[PDB]
Design an enzyme around this catalytic site. Structure first.
Site, PDB file in Angstrom:
ATOM      1  N   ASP A 131       0.810  -1.338   0.075  1.00  0.00           N
ATOM      2  CA  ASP A 131       0.030  -0.210  -0.038  1.00  0.00           C
ATOM      3  C   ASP A 131       0.883   1.329   0.012  1.00  0.00           C
ATOM      4  O   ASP A 131       1.986   1.152   0.181  1.00  0.00           O
ATOM      5  CB  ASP A 131      -0.998  -0.077   1.162  1.00  0.00           C
ATOM      6  CG  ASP A 131      -0.260  -0.200   2.550  1.00  0.00           C
ATOM      7  OD1 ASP A 131       0.476   0.895   2.848  1.00  0.00           O
ATOM      8  OD2 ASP A 131      -0.377  -1.248   3.241  1.00  0.00           O
ATOM      9  N   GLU A 154      20.890 -23.578 -19.220  1.00  0.00           N
ATOM     10  CA  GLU A 154      19.880 -22.562 -18.389  1.00  0.00           C
ATOM     11  C   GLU A 154      20.676 -21.539 -17.791  1.00  0.00           C
ATOM     12  O   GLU A 154      20.156 -20.442 -17.772  1.00  0.00           O
ATOM     13  CB  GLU A 154      19.132 -23.878 -17.208  1.00  0.00           C
ATOM     14  CG  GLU A 154      18.309 -24.821 -17.821  1.00  0.00           C
ATOM     15  CD  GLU A 154      17.996 -25.913 -16.988  1.00  0.00           C
ATOM     16  OE1 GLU A 154      18.640 -26.019 -16.094  1.00  0.00           O
ATOM     17  OE2 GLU A 154      17.008 -26.455 -17.348  1.00  0.00           O
TER      18      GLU A 154
END
Ligand SMILES: OC[C@H]1O[C@H](O[C@@H]2[C@@H](O)[C@@H](O)O[C@H](CO)[C@@H]2O)[C@H](O)[C@@H](O)[C@H]1O
Ligand SMILES: OC[C@H]1O[C@H](O[C@@H]2[C@@H](O)[C@@H](O)O[C@H](CO)[C@@H]2O)[C@H](O)[C@@H](O)[C@H]1O
Ligand SMILES: OC[C@H]1O[C@H](O[C@@H]2[C@@H](O)[C@@H](O)O[C@H](CO)[C@@H]2O)[C@H](O)[C@@H](O)[C@H]1O
Ligand SMILES: OC[C@H]1O[C@H](O[C@@H]2[C@@H](O)[C@H](O)O[C@H](CO)[C@@H]2O)[C@H](O)[C@@H](O)[C@H]1O
Ligand SMILES: OC[C@H]1O[C@H](O[C@@H]2[C@@H](O)[C@H](O)O[C@H](CO)[C@@H]2O)[C@H](O)[C@@H](O)[C@H]1O
Lengths: 721, 228, 721
Positions: free
Chosen positions: C528, C608
């Site tokens: 928030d 990877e």
């Protein structure tokens, strides 16, 4: 820059803010882009070519090219595309054609199909000419796309030539088609019914085929030749809209097809139903003009684009910017029951209230004392008119009023001298009884003798009489098609009827160009852009109820300018709805249209007379704003809304009309915001003298106050300082 | 009881829990009811006959009878009905027909069109035979409606005979039609695509015409011959 | 001109393109307009005053003035207004107040509530000060509204003073309220759940009350302190939106009430639940800051306005325009099972792939070998770290990586030395067993001794160690409120907890302003604008699934800038969803956020590893575009969509990321149009070298091509020439 450009294998058709970009791919024409202007188009949105199961191919070895999956500008059946076709010609043992692009030309300035209504004021236009051939069938199809430099509209039509040594038969030939990329779309159309014309309909595009069509021989009350393909979530103010429309007044179809891949085809043209067209060697067929119009400013954007194009390029220049006279029409006032005394007394009252034009409606000709006889007998009933029409007209002129007159040239009564003399002139089938409609029959305007007769009778009426206005009626649809010498000639007669009508009305409107012709078909039964090429106003609806008129006017002015839209203050209780409405509301509703009056002024109180005189005075002031100004819908009258509000802007004048249908209680007042003002402008409201900035009126808006009661209205009048 | 019944000017086609009740009105066939079983039908839901503007008439003087406004079981073009037609035959210079009811028969047990797939196990069925004629064109159209005693289904098909001395050409000939009363309706269909067959689609019935169709020579991956 | 103006009985609060215009009517404050700028406001949209049944009056004789029917900016109960109140103070035998306007002041430059997060960079602001008094109760309520010259946002808060000789108790005190005129409205909120944070919800405003609220002591995973009141039919591109938001991280409520007249009240503030506030004579209470933000450019308009305001006036200046380091976090990589060797080996691999920052997650302190003990014991586990934290940090620094560290200061385990020493420091009720959550308890930060202890322990940690980054966690919600000496002190402890937290974090972030603090609460459990005042990034969600992240990122960046939004490439099968996703898609999805990595790099293949090195190289290039650029949503990932697409523009760089969830077959390719380009601009697509005009990309768009398969993605990279 606008106009047409040919660049390698791309053709650019460039109107103001609207482009159609076509690619020639080995004789096949692909729709690359239709929408906002793009120069130097590379193909970001090209179709990805892949093997789509059951989508077949013009060559054995390339499975990824298929007319089933390419976006096109015309549609054939039988070459692998299974979407609905828009050209289909029978020749020899087949109705397979394979038209291939051979050559492109560019024209400048005016052109269009012979014998069919088409745009005018075309000096600043260019036309792309795409010449296609089917070498085996020895047929040519030529597509035309025309740019406009002042409007986001492109016009289209085609010509098919038979260059073979045998007869061929056209089965399908639409005027415009576009394949749009898979996306979510909604469609808006205008449908409705008699006394409910041009009802605005909105729905989601769904898999399958949606269509509107007329097989009535007229475009009809229940469908308008228009289809708006809209971006999902379009509003009045925002989103992309493409309006396809047809300048034709007979049988038409508009369709939207969503296929198996979610692609979308739209098209408009002559309806395949009740249509076939024989071409002898060397004969050709041209389709009516279609229009594609675009806005990215939502539904008000498309209204403005469409209205502007109509005003500038369809509606007669002589009238498109000319204030139209406030009229009295006697129809609802007297029906058939009138004579000279009654007429002049009505004329007297009309003059006192400042009305400008007096229209004599049905019942003045032959022995037309009711609606069961006399159509076809355009002889003046001098007994009923108490002398010659000439003497009547002089009387009306001397009272200071223009004179107008009702005709229904396309129709014939069984009980008429015309039918007694020429029963074969009626549309009919040998060995079948007539089908009747309002107890009358339709004249076969495919018969050149019928057209010649009407040109003659009507030219005579107009040259020998000082008529200022004509109301041209048409009160039934076409049944019992069988006047052809062969089945094929019968299949052609509905379109030939239209060609006959257009020959007739283009002749008379041109030869009598000072006369204002208002079209009519039991109100709005043929309110389309074909008619509006010759008739600059239309009787929008027989429904003259102030409240029932709300959705009607909404639709009738959706694509067509307000100036076209006949609207009359009539008596209460209203003759169609059985409803009492305030005279104030009848006035304000009709004043959102092209104002006239249609009630027995001689039977009103002194007060009701004063009110009408006040209404006429007011409208003389508002007429330029309404007729020549820009229209903004603020609250739409639909099935759920309890309200209607429409704004007009014209220079320093802004007016807003508000109507509430049902009385409400314990409901907060509506806040009505105006549109398209100068934020910094100062706007003086006539009723209270207060001055509001444009920002206030647009962003805060008006608290709308009404007393208790049904069908109340009010108007706000502002002057920008 | 199930099967077919002829009672004055009503014909009752009675399957299990489904009835089609047709009225012969001076040669015109009117759909009175299609739905749950009704015996002793009186006509509570009859069309109210009024003058509807631009809806024309077979006689000059009666403006309230119009095939544009009557609910029917087959559709013609050119007699005042402007809804989409389901029979249209070219003969001589026209494709106007005016088929009028002349006679009804009832069959029991198996029957169906020759050369086309049709129901089997029909011992407990009856078939209403509605013989229509166009005397001028010298054509017959015969409608068949078959009851089933164990299922809420009625089967239908038609036969058109050319009894004239000239070639005629059928342009339209559907297998079933019904006019349903104005109300709110939705439709369900099965469409989709290859590798997406029979996708269930549901939508509101809207003013205008909605259709699914195949022009592929096979019914196709993207539409099934069904409409709910 | 912007700022505050007082003109007769009107007050104008004028931010950029947003005005609040208030009228003083005999001591009552009326909301006249909130929306686009209006100067010289006259009152076109004033409430029409009438007798509304059961709506009562401050005087006997005037039945048409009622606070039940006037539009207001704060709400009281008991004076005739029955809409939900936003101020309610108990004093003596009543909780009726009647605050009346007495005086207005204007401040310039910075101001805000003491002890609560509030806007910064306020030099070009003015604040309207509306001083209200209840003379009988001897209370003052002072309302503040602040303008911003560079953003369509107004900030608000209030102060209540007790000027009486007795204790009073605040029961309700919201931060902002507005009465909007009856019209059709929709609301957008962000709700969802843990691992489904900030789910975008849209619905129609209906008669009655809709609310979102937290009673968890944190704003929570399932609701964000935001409510967007929208014009009916709002889209991404068009329509009016008003966003009300709260700079507070504790218990809040946002509500929209549609009353009996169809009027609409909206408000946001401290939740009445779990709140009361005692004021002794002379004490005062200030509420957290609320924001009202406006756009007339739809939901993308409101996103831009909100993001801009956050970047300029909330998020720390030190970081709001600073590219954030690409990090490795070891949590999903090792959980609690690590030691020094493993850490440095991971660090080695991180350095090889070009990662910038190494974050040591949970398990480094006390005897934290699992999640059942040791919270509260912020002592380095030198055994596990194989020496001092100082020596570890030096090792990480010498490998070329910044060092980051996990804390959870607000929490205490029963099994900890802290709890053994101070069991009373936990939030608890005398004579009730604990309620447990992740087997831990919450520290009572309303206890000043608790705040002092945490300032001390943490200041020590940060001054004695060279830490570059902190991840501040908070892994449960508050239960068992009963630490007060009285019931009222307990009712105050949830808000005092927040004041304690803000005192703590403002202190540390200010005293250690070079450190990047990322907030966290089991992912987005406290994401928030209160936290974002001190913590310029947030761990958006524990859900690190590439596909589940789509709606999460949609919501998490809806009102908050992308730069805040932590997103990590993690291992497969994903730990939350149990799903395999392509590494490419995990990369592209995380690259729509603030990129990091959270998997065991030491266990990846050579391939990877190369892929991740390529991803890091790519993002080093895209980071300014993503973090500093303008965000445009193109396809929203919601419940029905099978797709997601997001564009970023930054100077001459335009990128677009596209993701498809489920594989499709026999479905036409999506057409993806870009936004906010120059029509005439030339845009070179990196992958194919083709140059497209902005018009083409915006109006024709890209045919999006993918192979067969789930969870595939692609990116388009353009350079404007
Ligand atoms: O314009 C395209 C066609 O042009 C030629 O025919 C036209 C014919 O359509 C009509 O316009 O009449 C003129 C009069 O000279 C021409 O004959 C070709 O014969 C067609 O194949 C087609 O190209
Ligand atoms: O069954 C209705 C028709 O019956 C007669 O014709 C049939 C014909 O349709 C076919 O079934 O072949 C048989 C063989 O005898 C009959 O000829 C009438 O000719 C039709 O008018 C029609 O009544
Ligand atoms: O600012 C409005 C209030 O001002 C006065 O009190 C303040 C108090 O709120 C706080 O800011 O502390 C300062 C320090 O001087 C002042 O005392 C009035 O007492 C209040 O009634 C109210 O006007
Ligand atoms: O006959 C004059 C009349 O013609 C058209 O209206 C009629 C309508 O009055 C009558 O009730 O129905 C027929 C169709 O059944 C027509 O709609 C004109 O539209 C009307 O203005 C008037 O001129
Ligand atoms: O403990 C370290 C861990 O804390 C937070 O996540 C946890 C989650 O791993 C666990 O499964 O559940 C609790 C709540 O029950 C927390 O959500 C951080 O968000 C995470 O990043 C990690 O740091």
């Amino acid at each position: 820059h606008m106009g047409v450009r040919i660049e390698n294998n791309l053709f650019y058709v460039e109107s103001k803010n609207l482009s159609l970009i076509i690619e020639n791919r080995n004789g096949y024409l692909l729709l690359k882009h239709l929408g906002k202007t793009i120069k130097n188009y590379k193909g970001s949105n090209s179709v990805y070519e892949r093997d789509h199961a059951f989508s077949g191919n013009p060559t054995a070895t390339n499975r990824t090219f298929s007319l089933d999956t390419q976006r096109q500008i015309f549609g054939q059946h039988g070459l692998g595309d299974f979407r609905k076709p828009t050209i289909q010609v029978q020749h020899s043992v087949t109705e397979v054609t394979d038209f291939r692009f051979v050559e492109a030309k560019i024209l400048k300035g005016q052109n269009g199909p012979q014998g069919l209504p088409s745009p005018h004021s075309m000096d600043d236009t260019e036309t792309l000419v795409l010449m296609l051939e089917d070498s085996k069938a020895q047929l040519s199809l030529t597509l035309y796309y025309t740019t406009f430099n002042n409007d986001a509209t492109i016009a289209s039509y085609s010509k098919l030539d038979n260059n073979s040594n045998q007869e061929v038969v056209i089965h399908k030939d639409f005027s415009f088609m576009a394949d749009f990329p898979a996306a979510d779309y909604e469609i808006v159309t205008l449908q409705g019914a008699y006394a409910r014309e041009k009802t605005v309909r909105r729905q989601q595009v769904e898999q399958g085929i949606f269509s509107i069509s007329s097989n009535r021989g007229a475009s009809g009350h229940a469908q308008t030749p228009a289809l708006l393909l809209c971006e999902q979530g379009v509003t009045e103010d925002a989103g992309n809209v493409f309006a396809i429309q047809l300048m034709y007044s007979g049988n038409f179809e508009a369709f939207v097809q969503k296929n198996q891949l979610n692609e979308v085809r739209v098209a408009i043209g002559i309806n395949p139903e009740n249509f076939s067209w024989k071409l002898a060697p060397e004969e050709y067929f041209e389709t009516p003009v279609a229009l594609v119009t675009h806005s990215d400013q939502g539904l008000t954007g498309i209204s403005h684009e469409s209205q502007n194009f109509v005003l500038k390029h369809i509606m007669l220049s002589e009238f498109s910017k000319k204030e139209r006279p406030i009229l009295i029409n006697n129809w609802e006032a007297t029906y058939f029951d009138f004579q000279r005394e009654k007429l002049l007394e009505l004329a007297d009252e009309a003059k006192k209230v400042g009305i400008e034009l007096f229209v004599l409606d049905d019942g003045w000709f032959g022995n037309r004392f009711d609606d069961n006889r006399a159509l076809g007998d355009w002889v003046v009933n001098e007994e009923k008119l108490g002398g010659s029409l000439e003497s009547l007209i002089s009387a009306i002129h001397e009272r200071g009023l223009q004179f107008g007159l009702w005709l229904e040239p396309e129709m014939i009564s069984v009980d008429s001298d015309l039918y007694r003399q020429h029963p074969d002139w009626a549309i009919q089938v040998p060995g079948y009884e007539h089908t009747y409609s309002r107890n009358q029959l339709v004249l076969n305007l495919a018969n050149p003798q019928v057209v010649e007769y009407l040109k003659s009778v009507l030219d005579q009426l107009l040259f020998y009489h000082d008529i200022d206005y004509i109301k041209w009626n048409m009160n039934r649809n076409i049944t019992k098609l069988g006047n052809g010498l062969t089945y094929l000639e019968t299949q052609m007669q509905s379109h030939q009827y239209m060609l006959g009508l257009y020959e007739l009305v283009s002749y008379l409107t041109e030869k009598h160009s000072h006369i204002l012709f208002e079209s009519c078909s039991g109100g709005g039964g043929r309110n389309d852009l074909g008619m509006m090429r010759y008739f600059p106003q239309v009787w929008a609806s027989d429904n003259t109820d102030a409240i029932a008129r709300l959705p009607i006017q909404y639709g009738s002015s959706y694509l067509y300018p307000t100036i076209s839209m006949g609207a009359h203050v009539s008596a209460v209780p209203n003759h169609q709805m059985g409803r009492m409405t305030p005279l104030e509301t009848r006035g304000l509703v009709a004043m959102m249209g092209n104002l006239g009056y249609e009630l027995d002024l001689t039977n009103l109180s002194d007060e009701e007379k004063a009110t009408i005189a006040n209404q006429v005075n007011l409208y003389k002031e508002l007429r330029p704003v309404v007729q020549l100004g820009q229209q903004y819908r603020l609250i739409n009258p639909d099935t759920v809304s309890n309200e209607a509000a429409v704004q007009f802007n014209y220079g320093n004048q802004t007016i807003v009309t508000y109507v509430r249908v049902l009385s409400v209680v314990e409901t907060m007042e509506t806040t009505l915001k105006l549109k398209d003002l100068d934020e910094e402008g100062l706007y003086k409201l006539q009723e209270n003298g207060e001055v509001y900035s444009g920002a206030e009126l647009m962003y805060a808006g008006l608290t709308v106050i009404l007393s208790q009661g049904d069908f109340l209205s009010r108007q706000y009048i502002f002057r920008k300082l």
